[PDB]
């Protein structure tokens, strides 16, 4: 019955020894969603498509036909170990790059990871980028093993040779931790004797680990028999799937008590002795309430659903709470918890769970949720990838452009790595992502759930702008002439660049704990000292020595800086890599003459001069591009890449196969899976793995900024600094 498991959850639920809360990462293909649901099944939870709210869905076999992941899956198991009962909660996530969003989302949720390995395939590119987005979140991981049945069957190899390319998987993985983490590589290092490593079939069943093997008895020679005998259906019964890796989560998989005074490290910056910050390290219910949104989603009949990891405290309905960066306190509807793959309501929650909630009318991806409203907000959900491609959408039927604006802007909310720019003038919105099928998914499902039929333009990269050198002191003037601000602009070095991507700082950590932070990275003492604002990738230090006013008209001095970020001087493209400083000002004495009319064109004027005295330039976005292939195609392959302005980075070979690793410009990239087979007779095999952004070469400045000044209708006129400091 699901009489017995709401109440076996609910039970567990205030108990925080026994819950784990785990996601299950992988490379494309690996095996993620056949891990998932057969854990569940073993477990005795009722399926998917069984679930209440599935009813009255229908198979669109579209969709299925690919049958892969797009959206995040919560769900939730019950398993008894060693005579006590666990609940178990898990995120099955995507494995395609496009994706990836989902992924960052999940492993802020989670303590605790289990990374999937083919065992055919060995470990590829995105099995390094789950890894190190779990650790960056210090989530502990473990190792999964899959497919090994296509090992035993396809290679029909020695019982030693099993032992061996198993345990080059491991080492692998290994060297990826050691490399990512030296300093606590020898705590995470994952030893298969004790049992952080499980080999098997997800597929079949089955799996087996070193103290379930000899807690058992069977060998290698008896696993390779049951497999080339067509007998993988008993050898399940003698090592369950669910057996051995349930009991692997249970056994080395951090419980909240162990582990949120470890998250916290990474994901706040507030005061870790404060009220809020012990009662959050002890998942204390009685703390006031930290409420971490992971997700969005809509429901058909309760509205909108704010999923996330509840820290402190305890939630029901009727409970005010405010939502961070906004005025008014939003009032609790129903508490809610995944059991098996349903979402049921209960009459409270407490901290240590993943939990579900509605009536929070102002919450979004990234929110914090608590008593006070003064808490310090959690650090933001970083996505390591900007959006790369756009196109532009428009209804089909006039009639549809109201209901197609709303429905934009309710499906950027529930994917924030998408952008969506509406334009009511035109008609024409433009939706920016992270690669062709991203957006693909995306039209798909506003033509078939939200019932408005669409039509989108060809695909086009998305650029960036910076400097290239230093500039200035540079001065730009506001509208009545009486102040003027002095300012000076130049690269971020790549090591400060790199404490802001990884949110590393932030304006919310106190100021000595900043300072050395940039001091041990390379930055001057001053300008360590001096930095007032963090946007995106670019900063902004005020260096003036004490200037009256200074302070209470800086929030407008910034408000231009983010004016000019959101789009540069060259071609209205996004900015990235800034360090501006503000070397003087003079302001006016009586509050009237130096508002916003006055002091934001000024800011905007001066950085948008300086960035033009300092070799403003675009940079493309490139992609790293791996290409498996044999040995009579690779000549094909080698042509193609290097004809859309490819370079060569290395090459491997092993047997009959050599692995291409290329970088290629997204721009050029477009086509290339069918035309990477039509040049290598349908042999080739690839993937990619973003790299960053290079600078567009100096002939071809000139050519690229007139071409996106002519597809936005803007003049097309190069910049010139006088058209700015008048
Ligand atoms: N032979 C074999 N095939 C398996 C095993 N586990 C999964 N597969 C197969 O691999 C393919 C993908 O499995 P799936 O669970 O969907 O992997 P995934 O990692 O979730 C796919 P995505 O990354 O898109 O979410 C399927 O055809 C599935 O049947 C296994 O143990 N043995
Ligand atoms: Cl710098
Ligand atoms: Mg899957």
Known sequence: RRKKMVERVTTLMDKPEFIRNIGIVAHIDHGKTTLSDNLLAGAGMISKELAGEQLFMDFDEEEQKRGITIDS??????????????????????????????????????????????????????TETVLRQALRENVVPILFINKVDRLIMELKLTPQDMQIRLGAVIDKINKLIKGMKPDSYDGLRLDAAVGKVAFGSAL????????????????????????????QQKLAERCPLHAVVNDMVIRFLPNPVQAQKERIKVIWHGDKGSEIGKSMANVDPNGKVALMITDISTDPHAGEVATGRLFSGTLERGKEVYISGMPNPNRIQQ?????????????????????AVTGLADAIVGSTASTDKAMVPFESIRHVSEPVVTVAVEAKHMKDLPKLVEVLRQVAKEDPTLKVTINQETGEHLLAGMGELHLEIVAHRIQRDKHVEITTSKPLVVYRETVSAHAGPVEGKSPNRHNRFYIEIEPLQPAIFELVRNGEISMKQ????????????????????????????????????????LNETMELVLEGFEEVIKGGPLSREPVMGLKVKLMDAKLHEDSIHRGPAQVI??????????????????????????????????????????????????????????????????????????????????????????????????????????????????????????????
Not at 335 to 355: K, Q, S, W, Y
């Open 601 to 726: 064109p000024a800011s905007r004027q001066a950085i948008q001069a300086a960035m033009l005295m300092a070799g403003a330039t675009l940079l493309e976005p490139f992609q790293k591009v791996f290409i498996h292939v044999p040995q009579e195609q690779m000549g094909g392959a080698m042509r193609e890449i290097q004809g859309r302005r490819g370079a060569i980075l290395d090459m491997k070979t092993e047997g009959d196969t050599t692995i291409i690793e290329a970088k290629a410009p997204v721009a050029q990239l477009f086509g290339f899976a069918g035309d990477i087979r039509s040049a290598t007779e349908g042999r080739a095999m690839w993937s990619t793995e973003f790299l960053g952004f290079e600078p567009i070469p100096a002939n071809m400045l000139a050519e690229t900024v007139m071409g996106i000044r002519q597809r936005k209708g803007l003049k097309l006129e190069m910049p010139k600094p006088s058209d700015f400091i008048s």
């Open 335 to 355: 508490v809610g918890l995944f059991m098996g793959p349903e979402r049921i309501e209960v009459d409270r929650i407490t901290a240590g769970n993943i939990v």
């Open 204 to 231: 079949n069943n089955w799996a087996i680990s070193v103290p379930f093997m000899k807690k058992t008895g069977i060998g290698f020679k008896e696993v390779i028999e049951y497999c080339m005998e067509d007998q």
């Open 510 to 549: 106190q100021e000595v704990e900043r300072r050395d932070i940039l001091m041990k990275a390379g930055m001057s003492k001053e300008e360590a000292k001096g930095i007032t604002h963090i946007s995106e990738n670019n900063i902004f230090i005020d260096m003036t020595k004490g200037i009256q006013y």
């Open 73 to 126: 899956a919560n769900v939730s198991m019950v398993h008894e170990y060693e005579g006590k009962e666990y609940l178990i909660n898990l995120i099955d996530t995507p494995g395609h790059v496009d994706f990836g969003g989902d992924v960052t989302r999940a492993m802020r949720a989670v303590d605790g990871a289990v990374v999937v390995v083919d065992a055919v395939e060995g470990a590829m590119p995105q």
